[PDB]
Amino acid sequence: SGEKDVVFLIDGSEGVRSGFPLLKDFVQRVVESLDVGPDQVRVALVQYSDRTRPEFYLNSHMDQQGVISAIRRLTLLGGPTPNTGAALEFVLRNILTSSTGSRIAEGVPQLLIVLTAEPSGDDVRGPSVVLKQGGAVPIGIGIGNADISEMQTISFIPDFAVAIPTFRELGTIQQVISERVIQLNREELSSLK
């Protein structure tokens, strides 16, 4: 993979309560495929609903076992709606920063994996533009009642968006999502607009 910064942005609103254990499994499984280390892949995770709660930053746990432990202990944030736009902007402002471990200034890809299961409670259009202008490379994964149109808007290019019918089908895309993290590189990303 070379070096990558990978941020998981996870909808923790009421709509995901039932599916949350499977969401945690999926994230763990993606991380199991990566070479996590201070000099390799760094991982961060944020939950969101009507507010955004960082769980860990890119420099919080820089070995795989520790990142996996942090994922396993996650508890549902809770909340009435997924304000996905506000959460995207929070990530750009507060997570993709040198001071919290991001290698953005050195040209390391900033991969953002967004997992949500409802239509956004806020407008994602404006935030999506800002995020991509700011150097984030998002992959929007919309589960269940999420809108693939919103995932297309959020994603680095529309074709990065993924729809899956149910939380139980997250396993079916773990391999392809891992491979994106591993295979995406700075120059290839630049070539895509």
Numbering used by the authors: 1022 to 1214
Sentences from the study reporting this entry:
One of these missense mutations, R1064Q in human (R1064Qh) that is located in the N5 domain, was found in an UCMD patient (Lampe et al., 2005). To gain insight into the UCMD causing mechanism of the R1064Q mutant in human, the equivalent mutation R1061Qm in mouse was inserted into the murine collagen VI α3N5 domain by mutagenesis PCR and the crystal structure of the corresponding recombinant protein was determined at 1.2 Å resolution. The overall structure of the mutant VWA domain is very similar to the wild-type collagen VI α3N5 domain with an rmsd of 0.54 Å. The most significant structural difference is around the C terminus where the α6 helix of the mutant has a small angle with respect to the wild-type leading to a 1.5 Å displacement of the helix in the C-terminal extension. Poor electron density after residue L1213 in the mutant precluded the unambiguous assignment of the remainder of the C-terminal extension residues K2014–G2024. The residue of the R1061Qm mutation is preceding the beginning of the β2 strand and is located near the N terminus. Comparison of the wild-type and mutant structures shows that the side chains of the wild-type arginine and mutant glutamine are surface exposed and are pointing in approximately opposite directions while the remainder of the local conformation is the same. The crystal packing of the R1061Qm collagen VI α3N5 domain is different from the wild-type. While the arginine residue in the wild-type is in close proximity to the α2α3 loop of the neighboring molecule, the glutamine residue of the R1061Qm mutant interacts with the C-terminal part of the adjacent molecule (data not shown). The charge difference in the mutant and the difference in crystal packing also indicate the possibility that this mutation may alter intra- or intermolecular interactions and therefore disturb the assembly of collagen VI.
Collagen VI is a ubiquitously expressed extracellular matrix protein that forms a structurally unique network of beaded microfilaments. All collagen VI chains consist of a relatively short triple-helical region as well as of N- and C-terminal globular structures that are largely made up of VWA domains. Von Willebrand factor A (VWA) domains consist of about 200 amino acid residues and act as interaction modules in many intra- and extracellular proteins, e.g., in copines, integrins, von Willebrand factor, complement factors B and C2, matrilins, and collagens. The collagen VI α3N5 domain structure is the first solved structure of a collagen VWA domain and differs from other VWA domains in having an extended C-terminal region comprising residues N1206–G1224.
